[PDB]
Scaffold this active site. Structure first.
Site, short mmCIF file in Angstrom:
data_model
loop_
_atom_site.label_atom_id
_atom_site.label_comp_id
_atom_site.label_asym_id
_atom_site.label_seq_id
_atom_site.Cartn_x
_atom_site.Cartn_y
_atom_site.Cartn_z
N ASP A 1 3.29 1.71 -8.03
CA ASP A 1 2.11 1.35 -7.24
C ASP A 1 2.33 -0.20 -6.74
OD1 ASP A 1 0.61 3.79 -7.08
OD2 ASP A 1 -1.18 2.89 -7.94
N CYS B 1 6.95 6.75 4.42
CA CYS B 1 6.15 6.28 3.19
C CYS B 1 4.72 6.28 3.88
CB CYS B 1 6.30 4.98 2.40
SG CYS B 1 7.03 3.67 3.09
N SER B 2 3.67 5.24 3.53
CA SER B 2 2.55 5.00 4.10
C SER B 2 2.73 4.56 5.39
CB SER B 2 1.56 4.09 3.33
OG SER B 2 0.17 4.39 3.72
N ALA B 3 3.36 3.33 5.74
CA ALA B 3 3.63 2.72 7.01
C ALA B 3 5.00 3.09 7.33
CB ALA B 3 3.62 1.32 6.81
N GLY B 4 6.08 3.75 6.75
CA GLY B 4 7.39 4.02 7.27
C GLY B 4 8.24 2.88 7.69
N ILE B 5 8.24 1.73 6.76
CA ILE B 5 9.10 0.66 6.94
C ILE B 5 9.64 0.03 5.77
CG2 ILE B 5 7.92 0.07 9.13
CD1 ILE B 5 6.65 -2.15 8.08
N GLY B 6 9.05 0.37 4.60
CA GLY B 6 9.59 -0.50 3.35
C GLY B 6 10.33 0.39 2.65
N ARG B 7 9.79 1.26 2.00
CA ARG B 7 10.55 2.43 1.13
C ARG B 7 11.60 3.09 2.01
NH1 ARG B 7 5.22 4.36 -2.30
NH2 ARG B 7 4.53 2.44 -2.84
N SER B 8 10.97 3.43 2.94
CA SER B 8 11.82 4.28 4.17
C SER B 8 13.10 3.56 4.41
CB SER B 8 10.98 4.60 5.26
OG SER B 8 9.99 5.70 4.82
N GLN C 1 10.21 -4.67 3.34
CA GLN C 1 8.75 -5.38 3.64
C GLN C 1 8.77 -6.37 2.49
OE1 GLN C 1 5.00 -3.04 4.44
NE2 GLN C 1 6.07 -1.73 3.27
#
Ligand code: MG
Length: 280
Positions: free
Chosen positions: A180, A214-221, A261
């Site tokens: 989280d 992911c939620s926004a598609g920039i960090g984990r992605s 991010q």
């Protein structure tokens, strides 16, 4: 080496400064289509938009917009589509893009709920017997099978174009254990997950580009694609130590904003690439 660059940034505690450097150097292009009033309910976050030049267009004349970007890494010979977690009203669009772009795999790096909030619509069926129909894009989606493991789940899904009755097998690779808050302690399970996706053929040139979110598609992605590309380039090049993560990241940022991010995601990306090179 990048292991030496890594140890230097750690001892001098300069991750925050290096990350801010990338933010300042990062490309800026317009996102005019994303920001049109008619597309407001197609964006999850107001500060996460696809650049016009690299956006994925839906093949429909009504409204071709989805919050998704084609990241095309020429030298590595990989392409990826990074997108936001589908919204209640864009699941049909999402699966339209999978169909039209000829994707074989979908990589999902978030849970539908995290930190007590919804991060993503339940866009795939959880039971074999209860298939989904997306009426707006005339697609049927069916859970065929599901293999749940400690750190990830892989699902086989059948996507049918209802207009033509063609069907395809889509593979859903769901990394279910990203914490989280922060990033994983060890990159070992994320690398293992990345290798599983690779082994499926979902990242390979005989298929359309993998869809990653992911939620926004920039960090984990961004982490997934950055690590994958860096590792591939180290395999391909005469001089493996010439692969600069910061440069690869900046090249990826030409195609979608905000990739990676936090300074901690940057650090983790180094860790993942370094450990990945060790194993392979
Ligand atoms: Mg059952």
């Amino acid at each position: 080496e990048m292991e030496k660059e890594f140890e230097q940034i750690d001892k001098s505690g300069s991750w925050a400064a290096i990350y801010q450097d990338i933010r300042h150097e990062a490309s800026d292009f317009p996102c005019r289509v994303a920001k049109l009033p008619k597309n407001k309910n197609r964006n999850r976050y107001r500060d996460v938009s696809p650049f016009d030049h690299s956006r994925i267009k839906l093949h429909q004349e009504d409204n071709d917009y989805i919050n998704a970007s084609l990241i095309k890494m020429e030298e590595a010979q990989r392409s990826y589509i990074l997108t936001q977690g589908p919204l209640p009203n864009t699941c049909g669009h999402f699966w339209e893009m999978v169909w039209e772009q000829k994707s074989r795999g979908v990589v999902m790096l978030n849970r539908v709920m995290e930190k007590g909030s919804l991060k993503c619509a339940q866009y795939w069926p959880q039971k074999e017997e209860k298939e989904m129909i997306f009426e707006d894009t005339n697609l049927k989606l069916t859970l065929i099978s599901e293999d749940i493991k400690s750190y990830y789940t892989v699902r086989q899904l059948e996507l049918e174009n209802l207009t033509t009755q063609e069907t395809r097998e889509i593979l859903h690779f769901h990394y279910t254990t990203w914490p989280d808050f922060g990033v994983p302690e060890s990159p070992a399970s994320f690398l293992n997950f990345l290798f599983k996706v690779r082994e499926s053929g979902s990242l390979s040139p005989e298929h359309g580009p993998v869809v990653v979110h992911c939620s926004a598609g920039i960090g984990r992605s961004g982490t997934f694609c950055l690590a994958d590309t860096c590792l591939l380039l180290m395999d391909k090049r005469k001089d493996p130590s010439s692969v600069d993560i910061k440069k690869v990241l900046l090249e990826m940022r030409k195609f979608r904003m905000g990739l990676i991010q936090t300074a901690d995601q940057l650090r983790f990306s180094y860790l993942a690439v370094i450990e990945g090179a060790k194993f392979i």
